[PDB]
Design an enzyme around this catalytic site. Structure first.
Site, PDB file in Angstrom:
ATOM      1  N   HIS B 232       0.828  -1.193   0.000  1.00  0.00           N
ATOM      2  CA  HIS B 232       0.000   0.000   0.000  1.00  0.00           C
ATOM      3  C   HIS B 232       0.863   1.243   0.000  1.00  0.00           C
ATOM      4  O   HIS B 232       1.867   1.301   0.705  1.00  0.00           O
ATOM      5  CB  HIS B 232      -0.883   0.007   1.259  1.00  0.00           C
ATOM      6  CG  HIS B 232      -2.062   0.919   1.165  1.00  0.00           C
ATOM      7  ND1 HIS B 232      -1.975   2.274   1.411  1.00  0.00           N
ATOM      8  CD2 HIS B 232      -3.345   0.680   0.802  1.00  0.00           C
ATOM      9  CE1 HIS B 232      -3.152   2.832   1.192  1.00  0.00           C
ATOM     10  NE2 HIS B 232      -4.001   1.888   0.823  1.00  0.00           N
ATOM     11  N   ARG B 275      -3.337   0.915  -3.961  1.00  0.00           N
ATOM     12  CA  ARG B 275      -2.908  -0.459  -4.141  1.00  0.00           C
ATOM     13  C   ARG B 275      -3.514  -0.944  -5.445  1.00  0.00           C
ATOM     14  O   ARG B 275      -4.498  -0.374  -5.945  1.00  0.00           O
ATOM     15  CB  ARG B 275      -3.367  -1.333  -2.974  1.00  0.00           C
ATOM     16  CG  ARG B 275      -4.640  -0.870  -2.312  1.00  0.00           C
ATOM     17  CD  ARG B 275      -4.934  -1.734  -1.091  1.00  0.00           C
ATOM     18  NE  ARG B 275      -6.029  -1.180  -0.309  1.00  0.00           N
ATOM     19  CZ  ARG B 275      -6.942  -1.893   0.339  1.00  0.00           C
ATOM     20  NH1 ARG B 275      -6.912  -3.226   0.322  1.00  0.00           N
ATOM     21  NH2 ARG B 275      -7.914  -1.262   0.982  1.00  0.00           N
ATOM     22  N   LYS B 278      -7.453  -1.025  -6.971  1.00  0.00           N
ATOM     23  CA  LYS B 278      -8.333  -0.168  -6.191  1.00  0.00           C
ATOM     24  C   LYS B 278      -8.450   1.188  -6.939  1.00  0.00           C
ATOM     25  O   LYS B 278      -7.925   1.344  -8.062  1.00  0.00           O
ATOM     26  CB  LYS B 278      -7.902  -0.063  -4.719  1.00  0.00           C
ATOM     27  CG  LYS B 278      -8.114  -1.392  -3.962  1.00  0.00           C
ATOM     28  CD  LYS B 278      -8.545  -1.186  -2.510  1.00  0.00           C
ATOM     29  CE  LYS B 278      -9.996  -0.719  -2.407  1.00  0.00           C
ATOM     30  NZ  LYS B 278     -10.407  -0.302  -1.024  1.00  0.00           N
ATOM     31  N   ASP B 281      -6.984   8.241  -6.018  1.00  0.00           N
ATOM     32  CA  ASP B 281      -7.268   9.110  -4.889  1.00  0.00           C
ATOM     33  C   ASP B 281      -6.180  10.176  -4.827  1.00  0.00           C
ATOM     34  O   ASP B 281      -4.983   9.865  -4.806  1.00  0.00           O
ATOM     35  CB  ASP B 281      -7.291   8.295  -3.580  1.00  0.00           C
ATOM     36  CG  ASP B 281      -7.554   9.155  -2.321  1.00  0.00           C
ATOM     37  OD1 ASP B 281      -7.395  10.396  -2.339  1.00  0.00           O
ATOM     38  OD2 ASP B 281      -7.903   8.577  -1.270  1.00  0.00           O
ATOM     39  N   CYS B 283      -4.935  11.929  -2.372  1.00  0.00           N
ATOM     40  CA  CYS B 283      -3.912  11.933  -1.312  1.00  0.00           C
ATOM     41  C   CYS B 283      -2.686  11.107  -1.710  1.00  0.00           C
ATOM     42  O   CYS B 283      -1.584  11.401  -1.266  1.00  0.00           O
ATOM     43  CB  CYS B 283      -4.466  11.502   0.055  1.00  0.00           C
ATOM     44  SG  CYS B 283      -5.109   9.810   0.172  1.00  0.00           S
ATOM     45  N   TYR B 284      -2.861  10.144  -2.621  1.00  0.00           N
ATOM     46  CA  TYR B 284      -1.737   9.319  -3.090  1.00  0.00           C
ATOM     47  C   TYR B 284      -0.823  10.103  -4.019  1.00  0.00           C
ATOM     48  O   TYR B 284       0.229   9.614  -4.421  1.00  0.00           O
ATOM     49  CB  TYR B 284      -2.222   8.039  -3.758  1.00  0.00           C
ATOM     50  CG  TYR B 284      -2.981   7.160  -2.785  1.00  0.00           C
ATOM     51  CD1 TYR B 284      -4.241   6.664  -3.111  1.00  0.00           C
ATOM     52  CD2 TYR B 284      -2.465   6.882  -1.509  1.00  0.00           C
ATOM     53  CE1 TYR B 284      -4.980   5.920  -2.194  1.00  0.00           C
ATOM     54  CE2 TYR B 284      -3.194   6.137  -0.578  1.00  0.00           C
ATOM     55  CZ  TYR B 284      -4.460   5.661  -0.928  1.00  0.00           C
ATOM     56  OH  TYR B 284      -5.235   4.942  -0.034  1.00  0.00           O
ATOM     57  N   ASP B 336     -10.363  13.843  -2.596  1.00  0.00           N
ATOM     58  CA  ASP B 336      -9.985  12.519  -3.061  1.00  0.00           C
ATOM     59  C   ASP B 336     -10.243  12.364  -4.565  1.00  0.00           C
ATOM     60  O   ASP B 336      -9.312  12.139  -5.325  1.00  0.00           O
ATOM     61  CB  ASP B 336     -10.767  11.507  -2.184  1.00  0.00           C
ATOM     62  CG  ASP B 336     -10.822  10.084  -2.739  1.00  0.00           C
ATOM     63  OD1 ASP B 336     -10.286   9.760  -3.816  1.00  0.00           O
ATOM     64  OD2 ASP B 336     -11.453   9.253  -2.057  1.00  0.00           O
ATOM     65  N   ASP B 343     -11.607  18.038   2.611  1.00  0.00           N
ATOM     66  CA  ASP B 343     -11.195  17.845   3.992  1.00  0.00           C
ATOM     67  C   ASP B 343      -9.749  18.311   4.055  1.00  0.00           C
ATOM     68  O   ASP B 343      -9.058  18.339   3.033  1.00  0.00           O
ATOM     69  CB  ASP B 343     -11.422  16.411   4.506  1.00  0.00           C
ATOM     70  CG  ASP B 343     -10.725  15.358   3.681  1.00  0.00           C
ATOM     71  OD1 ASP B 343      -9.495  15.416   3.584  1.00  0.00           O
ATOM     72  OD2 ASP B 343     -11.401  14.443   3.156  1.00  0.00           O
ATOM     73  N   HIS B 346      -6.919  15.866   2.631  1.00  0.00           N
ATOM     74  CA  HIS B 346      -6.707  15.814   1.194  1.00  0.00           C
ATOM     75  C   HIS B 346      -6.172  17.126   0.664  1.00  0.00           C
ATOM     76  O   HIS B 346      -5.486  17.156  -0.351  1.00  0.00           O
ATOM     77  CB  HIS B 346      -7.969  15.405   0.460  1.00  0.00           C
ATOM     78  CG  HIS B 346      -8.249  13.942   0.533  1.00  0.00           C
ATOM     79  ND1 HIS B 346      -9.070  13.387   1.490  1.00  0.00           N
ATOM     80  CD2 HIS B 346      -7.788  12.909  -0.210  1.00  0.00           C
ATOM     81  CE1 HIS B 346      -9.096  12.076   1.342  1.00  0.00           C
ATOM     82  NE2 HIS B 346      -8.327  11.761   0.316  1.00  0.00           N
TER      83      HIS B 346
END
Ligand SMILES: CC(C)=CCC/C(C)=C/CC/C(C)=C/CONC(=O)CP(=O)(O)O
Ligand SMILES: [Zn+2]
EC number: 2.5.1.58
Lengths: 11, 407, 323
Positions: B232, B275, B278, B281, B283-284, B336, B343, B346
């Site tokens: 992850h 990962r 999935k 997003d 934040c990645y 996201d 938020d 993020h």
């Protein structure tokens, strides 16, 4: 308000 | 040429990047397709509206959102009552990236508040009166370093902090997140981050930690929370960054790590997934893409001659397009993916990721790629600590003036 | 007793049985930062929690109060710690507590504290009998729940409950062959039981994976698994693999198939194979196809690979500058 199921968690 | 689309996500060939489900539908493909359809609407919005695309980072709006949040939050943040130092860090870092000064009224109040979160036995808790925990301890130290005043640095009780880290250290090299708490790779990173910044690393503090982190790398090339678990981005960033701090990156199979993270960037969306199989997003944009600067530095130290001199090993342009077009809330703040709400978490990481994507730096060599209007350029961020490189240098220099607790 | 969501729920400051305790307000300081405007219910429960925690009151009423504090913010690790102090101190029935945690995890399964609490209960009771079935129920709602898979690995490993897991893995791969968490679990089970060195096992695994690749050629997990189980021994160690992948190029191509070919060539070149040059060029041709057409999102990676292969495997690579 409760934590949103659609949000990220890091701790 | 005139027919040539300068935005990678809007080019006609880009439609070929859509998901091919081989006519075998499963929950994974159905979910992926839903996201792609929503993202395609975003990409196509300009065309369907008959307007020329302009990628603008809504700074004014993000600033208002952050400036207010640093002071007061609605009950929407009740769920983060045990993570207030993270709220401080996420907001202050976002402001730092946006190059907004931190008033001294603000700086002093953050210091005082973090002092109240500091435990008598060392470390910081999620709020005043809460037990110390490594995640809010990491956030608190980073926040105080972003402020960088003598006052900010002085808040940290270094002797107690070190005692605290030792009380969490396990025989197998790992660390608990807090007394009576869970163990996963986040602790190694949180501990190494705060211990290195404050100069409290004793000869044995991290005994076996590098080896334990190395056991978390799995068959995928990435790093899982604990040995045996799925790879992850959150945990991989923690693992690699901790190893970089410990100067033991070599314990990992850097080749399979590189192959795995690069594969995490979504061909259609442009952003990164956490990962394999999935969803994308924002934040990645940091947890995943931030690995590239780390890998570049590691591979370069091994004298890798094939390393680019101007780009990270990911599509910088596509990540920026994903963030700018799909992750901004009109009212301020980042998110996201389309469909999700903003938020501070993020907001912090989408911006951190944007900065990484805009700035390449490998010693004397420097090369920026700023998509959209030039005002979009953010301040650089350190790939290990995710605070300004200047703040990192300033903090370490200051703390090196002090002796490692006990001597 | 009185649920936090009960229509007749009453604030603690209005409960007779709590009249002796003075609530302890949160100490945020003279000029707060990141100050949360809590709802009435939240602040009320937490002001009373602060009071019991401060006094270290280990009572039945404090125990019941933690249930409410948890319901309000299940991520509050300090409350979970105090609750565990009370469970031991008050000699509370741990199976009743197991019933409680299973309900909590069902409602907030992406939380760190709830799974850790369940782990502590299982350790205390030294009983894993409800685990696999409980976890299976959570996985039935989110087949990729990270905490759930992690707790499952812990239970299986600590209690040696390996017997039916591969069967479980097969069931989930049937439901969604793209579930990467299940491929990771497949690897977890095999590594800790038979291992992959046993030729009959490795063989079976590759047959299975290639079969899944044929069925869904674009599923990246199967591809990652195939590479994951063969890469450590060396891809060049298996001469038939290459031939067999090339055979899928027609009706089963993907940037995944092309990428694997490059990995096979890369290792062949690493283990000084026959026709050093013929292989290198085949690899660079593929790296280019990938960077320019088939997998442009990774253009920087493919260009680097092509450059690395060129840097150490060109006919000039071992030739002195003077020649
Ligand atoms: C310094 C820290 C605290 C780093 C941690 C960063 C992250 C992002 C950790 C993630 C932990 C995790 C895997 C939680 C499981 O729930 N999250 C998801 O399922 C999100 P996704 O679907 O993207 O995997
Ligand atoms: Zn996220």
């Amino acid at each position: 308000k409760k934590k949103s199921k659609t949000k990220c968690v890091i701790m | 040429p005139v027919w040539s689309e300068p935005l990678y996500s809007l080019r006609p060939e880009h439609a070929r990047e859509r998901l091919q489900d081989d006519s075998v539908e499963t929950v994974t493909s159905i979910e992926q397709a839903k996201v792609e359809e929503k993202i395609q609407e975003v990409f196509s919005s300009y065309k369907f509206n008959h307007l020329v695309p302009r990628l603008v980072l809504q700074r004014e709006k993000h600033f208002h959102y952050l400036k207010r949040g640093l002071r007061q939050l609605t009950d929407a943040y009740e769920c983060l009552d045990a993570s207030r130092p993270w709220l401080c860090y996420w907001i202050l870092h976002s402001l730092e990236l946006l190059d907004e000064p931190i008033p001294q009224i603000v700086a002093t109040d953050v210091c005082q508040f973090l002092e109240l979160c500091q435990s008598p036995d060392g470390g910081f808790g999620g709020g005043p009166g809460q037990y110390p925990h490594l995640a809010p301890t990491y956030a608190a130290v980073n926040a105080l370093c972003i402020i960088g005043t003598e006052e900010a640095y002085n808040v940290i009780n270094r002797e107690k902090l070190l005692q605290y880290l030792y009380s969490l250290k396990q025989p197998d090299g790992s660390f608990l997140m807090h007394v009576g708490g869970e163990v996963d790779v986040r602790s190694a990173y949180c501990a190494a981050s705060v211990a290195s910044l404050t100069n409290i690393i004793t000869p044995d503090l991290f005994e076996g930690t590098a080896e334990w982190i190395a056991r978390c790398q799995n068959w995928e090339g990435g790093i899982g929370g604990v040995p045996g678990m799925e790879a992850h981005g959150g945990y991989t960033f923690c693992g690699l960054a901790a190893l970089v701090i410990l100067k033991k990156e070599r314990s990992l199979n850097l080749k399979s790590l590189l192959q795995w993270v690069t594969s995490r960037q979504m061909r259609f969306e442009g952003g990164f997934q956490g990962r394999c199989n999935k969803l994308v997003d924002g934040c990645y944009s940091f947890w995943q893409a931030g690995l590239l600067p780390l890998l570049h530095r590691a591979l370069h130290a091994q004298g890798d001659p094939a390393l680019s001199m101007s780009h990270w090993m990911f599509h910088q342009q596509a990540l920026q397009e994903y963030i700018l077009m799909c992750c901004q809330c009109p009212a301020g703040g980042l998110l996201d993916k389309p469909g999700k709400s903003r938020d501070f978490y993020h907001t912090c990481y989408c911006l951190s990721g944007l900065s990484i994507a805009q700035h390449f730096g490998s010693g004397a060599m420097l090369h920026d790629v700023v998509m959209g209007v030039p005002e979009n350029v953010l301040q650089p961020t350190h790939p290990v600590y995710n605070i300004g490189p200047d703040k990192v240098i300033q903090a370490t220099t200051h703390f090196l003036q002090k002796p490692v607790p006990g001597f | 007793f009185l649920s936090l969501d009960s229509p007749t729920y009453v604030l603690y400051r209005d409960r007779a049985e709590w009249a002796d305790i003075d609530p302890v307000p949160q100490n945020d300081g003279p000029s707060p930062v990141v100050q949360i405007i809590y709802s009435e219910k939240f602040r009320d429960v937490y002001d009373y929690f602060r009071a019991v925690l401060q006094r270290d009151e280990r009572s039945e009423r404090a125990f019941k109060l933690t249930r409410d504090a948890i319901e309000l913010n299940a991520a509050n690790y300090t409350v979970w710690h105090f609750r565990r102090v009370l469970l031991r101190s008050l000699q509370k029935d741990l199976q009743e507590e197991m019933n409680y945690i299973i309900a909590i995890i069902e409602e907030q399964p992406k939380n760190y504290q709830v799974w850790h609490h369940r782990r502590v209960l299982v350790e205390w009771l030294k009983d894993p009998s409800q685990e696999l079935e409980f976890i299976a129920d959570i996985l039935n709602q989110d087949a990729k729940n990270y905490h759930a898979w992690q707790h499952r690995q812990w239970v299986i490993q600590e209690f040696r409950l390996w017997d039916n897991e591969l069967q479980y893995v097969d069931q989930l791969l049937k439901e969604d062959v793209r579930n990467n968490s299940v491929w990771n679990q497949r690897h977890f089970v095999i590594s800790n039981t038979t291992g992959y060195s046993d030729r009959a096992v490795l063989e079976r695994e590759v047959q299975y994976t290639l079969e899944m690749i044929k069925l869904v050629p674009h599923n990246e997990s199967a591809w990652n698994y195939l590479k994951g189980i063969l890469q450590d021994r060396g891809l060049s160690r298996y001469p038939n693999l290459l031939n067999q992948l090339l055979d899928l190029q027609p009706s089963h191509s993907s940037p995944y198939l092309i990428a694997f070919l490059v990995d096979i060539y890369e290792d062949m070149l690493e283990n000084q194979c026959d026709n050093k040059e013929d292989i290198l060029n085949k690899a660079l041709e593929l790296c280019e196809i990938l960077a320019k057409e088939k997998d442009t999102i990774r253009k920087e990676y493919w260009r680097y690979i092509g450059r690395s292969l060129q840097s150490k495997h060109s006919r000039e690579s071992d030739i002195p500058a003077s020649v």
